[PDB]
Structures are given as C-alpha cells and as structure tokens.
C-alpha cells in the first residue's frame, strides 16, 4: 500500500490571519474512493483571498482549483491509472479535512468533482477551469435551467428567444457560464468594461454592454421584450442587485447571485460553493447547511457533462495569465487578485 510522504509545502494562513507558505505541512491519507494527486498547476481565485478572519481554519489547507499527475489510485477506483493526468476541486478550509487543499504539493481528489485532463490540455489550462465549471453548474441549477447534453449535436431549439442576463459577463465565472448556457439553448446577454467586450462575444454573450451606460436597464428591458426571467450576477455588490432587478421583466424573474446578499415577483438565491461535493458548510450566519446525496449526485452528473465538454473543445478554459514558481506566488497572485488587479485573466501558477 502507499505510503503518502511525512511532509510537504502547503499555503495555509497561521494563528496569526496571515497568509503562510508552510513546509512542514502534512500529506493527505488515500481515500479507496479517491487518487493520490501530485500537483502541478494551479488557478487563484477570489474565494481564497477571503478566506480570512472568521472565515479562516488556521492551518487548514488554501486553495480550490487543481492540476497534477496521479502517483496512486485508490482501490475502489476504476478507469483511472498511476500516471494519468487528472483536474479538480477542492473544498478550501474544511476543519473536518485540513489536509485537503489545492494549494499543496500533494492532494487527493474529492468526490467525482474532478476528471482525466484532455490529451491537447496543459496542466495550468485545464487548472483554470474546475471552479469555473462548478460555480456555473450551481447557478444554472438554481436559475432552474437544464444541464447542456454531453451529445447532442447541437442546443435544444425554443419558441422564442429566452435571454439570460449576466452581469459581469468578463467573469471568469461568467465566460464559463456563458458557453454552458448556449450549449443549452439560452441567449446571454453580458455586461463588463469595453475592453472585454470581444472576450464575452467569443463567450456566448449574444450582445454586450458596458455597465456603466446611463439607463442601461431600460436598454436591457427593450432588448428582452420587458419579459427577462433570468438574471445571474457575478459581481455581487449593492449596484449589480439594483441593475438586475431593474432589467428583470414586467411579469417577475429569477435573480442569482455568486455570493450572499442584504420591487415585487422576483425569486432570488445565491450560490454555496461546497455544495458541489454535497457537503454542506460549518460557517454560520448564512452559510451553514447540512450536506446531501442529491447534492453529491448533482456535482458528479455536472462533471461527468463537463468534462465531455472540455474533452471535444465545446467548453473552454478563461484567458490565462500563468505564473512559473512555487509557494511565495501564489500567496503573491492572491494579494494581485485580492486588489483587483486582474481583468479578463484567471491567474494560474504553474509549479516549478
Ligand atoms: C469549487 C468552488 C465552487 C464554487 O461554487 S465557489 C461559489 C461561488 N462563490 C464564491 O466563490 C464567493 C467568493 N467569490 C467572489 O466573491 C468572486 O469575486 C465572484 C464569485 C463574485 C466572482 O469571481 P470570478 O472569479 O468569477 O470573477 P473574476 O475575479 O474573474 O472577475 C473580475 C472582473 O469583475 C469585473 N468587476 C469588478 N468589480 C466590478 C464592479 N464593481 N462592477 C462591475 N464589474 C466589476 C471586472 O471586469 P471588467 O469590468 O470587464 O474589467 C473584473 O475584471
């Protein structure tokens, strides 16, 4: 049997709240259901900047999206050999888990929220797309929106055009959720900086405006017939709430949002990230929830949908901005994200 090593470098924040490349950290046991990962590339993403404060487990591991070269398989698993490439999520600061984290040397995979990397993909390619594709799986989930077909050979056809906003369409999130809305059917329609605006047309975005032109919504209205159901905001803030439920139809809509948040007929929900692996989260206020199968089976079906996806070219990775290095460069693309210095780019540190 493997025996995992004694120790490793992981990125954790210490009793301190600050953010620590720690070399002395642990290795993860080999679940039978899981395989062993060494990582090789990994992608940054707002969420571990935040995990801070109460929202930190001093030395639990940082750190969500991964890809590495299997060095073990467990032994309930099938169709995965030693060698083979795999990319993932993990569920970053888990205090029942503190040794699992993609930002570490060695991990395991969790769940089935993880596949075999494509053979025409490099590791920090296919690291930038794990959070991408689960956070745009949840949301369509709770827009209460169809999965894309694995097959089919092209997207379900509609009545007349059913438009999804989707505020903040330069997003990594966005331009991962925008492709899988397509591929189902629906019509996006973004907003984001002028800049970006090719990025959310080579996206899926069947139109895109800048977000701060005067009366916007009202231009948004007109363009869906005063009948938008379906707004998805990945910005989060007190003026993306304010825009889409000012773009929301006549008739009422659905309003979803990446984040918690504090006019009639608008149903509303947010995303919680761990939910993908049907665990809940241990986080108070509103973030506590028990774990469930049926979220479980959802985030296998989701992955075992989007990594055909991938695996035939239909879905693709955000523009990258790849780091080579080690520990330190990750803690400082954290800080880079943490300011916002990045737009239209998912940061990625290849490891070196
Ligand atoms: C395995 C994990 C699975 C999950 O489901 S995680 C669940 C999802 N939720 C969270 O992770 C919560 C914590 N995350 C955040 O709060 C993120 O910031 C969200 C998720 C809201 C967005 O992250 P994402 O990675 O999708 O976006 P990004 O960092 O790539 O986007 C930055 C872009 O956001 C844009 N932006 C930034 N501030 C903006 C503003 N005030 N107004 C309008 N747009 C704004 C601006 O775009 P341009 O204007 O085109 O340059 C900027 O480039």
Redesign the pocket.
């Known amino acids: 049997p493997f025996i995992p090593p004694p120790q490793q470098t992981a990125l954790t924040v210490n009793d301190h709240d600050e953010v620590t490349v720690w070399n002395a950290a642990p290795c993860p046991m080999l679940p039978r259901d899981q395989v062993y990962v060494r990582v090789e590339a990994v992608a940054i993403?707002?969420?571990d900047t935040?995990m801070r404060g109460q929202f930190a487990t001093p030395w639990a591991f940082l750190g969500?999206?991964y890809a590495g070269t299997v060095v073990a398989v467990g032994s309930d698993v099938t169709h995965i050999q030693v060698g083979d490439r795999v990319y993932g999520?993990?569920?970053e600061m888990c205090p029942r888990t503190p040794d699992q984290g993609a930002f570490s040397q060695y991990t395991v995979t969790r769940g089935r929220?993880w596949a075999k990397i494509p053979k025409g993909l490099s590791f920090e390619q296919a690291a930038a797309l794990?959070?991408?594709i689960?956070?745009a799986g949840?949301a369509m989930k709770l827009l209460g929106l169809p999965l894309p077909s694995p097959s089919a050979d092209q997207p379900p056809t509609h009545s007349k055009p059913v438009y999804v906003l989707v505020?903040?369409?330069?997003?990594?999130?966005?331009t991962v959720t925008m492709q899988m809305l397509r591929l189902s059917g629906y019509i996006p329609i973004a907003?984001?900086?002028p800049?970006?605006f090719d990025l959310a047309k080579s996206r899926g975005a069947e139109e895109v405006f800048d977000?701060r032109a005067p009366n916007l919504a009202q231009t948004i209205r007109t363009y869906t017939k005063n009948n938008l159901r379906y707004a998805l905001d990945?910005?989060?803030?007190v003026?993306?709430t304010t825009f889409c439920f000012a773009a929301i139809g006549r008739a009422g809509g659905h309003y979803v949002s990446?984040?918690p948040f504090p006019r009639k007929m608008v149903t509303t929900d947010w995303?919680?990230?761990?939910?993908?692996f049907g665990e809940g989260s241990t986080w108070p206020a509103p973030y506590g929830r028990p774990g469930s199968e049926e979220e479980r089976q959802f985030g296998e079906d989701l992955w075992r949908i989007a990594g055909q996806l991938v695996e035939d070219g239909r879905l693709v990775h955000?523009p990258l901005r790849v780091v080579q290095g080690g520990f330190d460069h990750i803690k400082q693309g954290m800080e880079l994200?943490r300011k916002?210095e990045?737009?239209?780019?998912?940061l990625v540190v290849r490891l070196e």
């Not at 505020?167 to 990594?172: K, L, P, R």
């Not at 990945?234 to 803030?237: D, E, G, H, Y």
């Open positions: 993403n707002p969420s935040k969500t999206d999520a993990q569920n929220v794990p959070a991408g689960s956070t949840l505020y903040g369409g330069s997003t990594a999130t966005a907003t984001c900086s800049h970006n977000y990945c910005i989060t803030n003026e993306s990446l984040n995303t919680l990230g761990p939910t993908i955000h994200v916002g990045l737009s239209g780019e998912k």
